[PDB]
Amino acid sequence: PQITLWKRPLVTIKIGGQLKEALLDTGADDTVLEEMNLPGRWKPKMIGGIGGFIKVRQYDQILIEICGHKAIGTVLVGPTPVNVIGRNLLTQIGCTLNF
Amino acid sequence: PQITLWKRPLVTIKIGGQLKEALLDTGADDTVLEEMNLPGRWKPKMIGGIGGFIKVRQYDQILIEICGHKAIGTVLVGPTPVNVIGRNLLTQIGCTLNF
Numbered sequence A, B: 001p002q003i004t005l006w007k008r009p010l011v012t013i014k015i016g017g018q019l020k021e022a023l024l025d026t027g028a029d030d031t032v033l034e035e036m037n038l039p040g041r042w043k044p045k046m047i048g049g050i051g052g053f054i055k056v057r058q059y060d061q062i063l064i065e066i067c068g069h070k071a072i073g074t075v076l077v078g079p080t081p082v083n084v085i086g087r088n089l090l091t092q093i094g095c096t097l098n099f
């Protein structure tokens, strides 16, 4: 579909058998999601943006479905105020910016 | 243009007569630029990001050209890690997400 940007580009995603709401975020290199106790191994990471850094858990090869488009890649889990789908997964669902 | 997301969506902007590089950021409500000199009045403002809140200088009705497309709108100036173009200006240049 086509998503205008008058409001935040929020979509439903399916991850870890749970449905959540996330932003389609061209400004995020990678995907960052709210605290969720996913199974499997992970490695610690620090990610920075406006206001500073947060500590997150990096999970690899995670399956996510975004508006019915399946993707698989890195998901960073931590105390983020918003869930963002970043370019690592947006490329996989074929998402472009257009103007 | 149609912009894929294998790389950061970086573009050249013109603001205050100076060229700069900025990131097209659909996950940003607002446009935030790194410290710079801009003419005119400004009001102290706070904005929150992934890591917390920062103090910015808010400039209203600022001419800014983004990849050859003109906008006039609010530009926040402050200690952001990256020059980001947010939805307040992406809508002005007609930017949509498409997949």
Ligand SMILES: CC(C)CN(C[C@@H](O)[C@H](Cc1ccccc1)NC(=O)O[C@H]1CO[C@H]2OCC[C@H]21)S(=O)(=O)c1ccc2c(c1)CC[C@@H]2O
Binding pocket: A025, A027, A028, A029, A030, A031, A032, A047, A048, A049, A050, A081, A082, A084, A086, B023, B025, B026, B027, B028, B029, B030, B031, B032, B047, B048, B049, B050, B051, B082, B084, B086
């Ligand atoms: C600033 C960008 C360059 C990087 N961010 C992504 C932007 O889209 C953030 C997303 C966001 C939205 C809502 C709340 C919190 C965050 N928007 C943002 O800060 O918006 C400002 C300005 O407008 C306001 O409206 C929203 C908030 C205000 S990030 O979240 O910091 C990030 C993500 C992944 C990753 C990193 C860093 C590092 C490595 C990893 O890839």
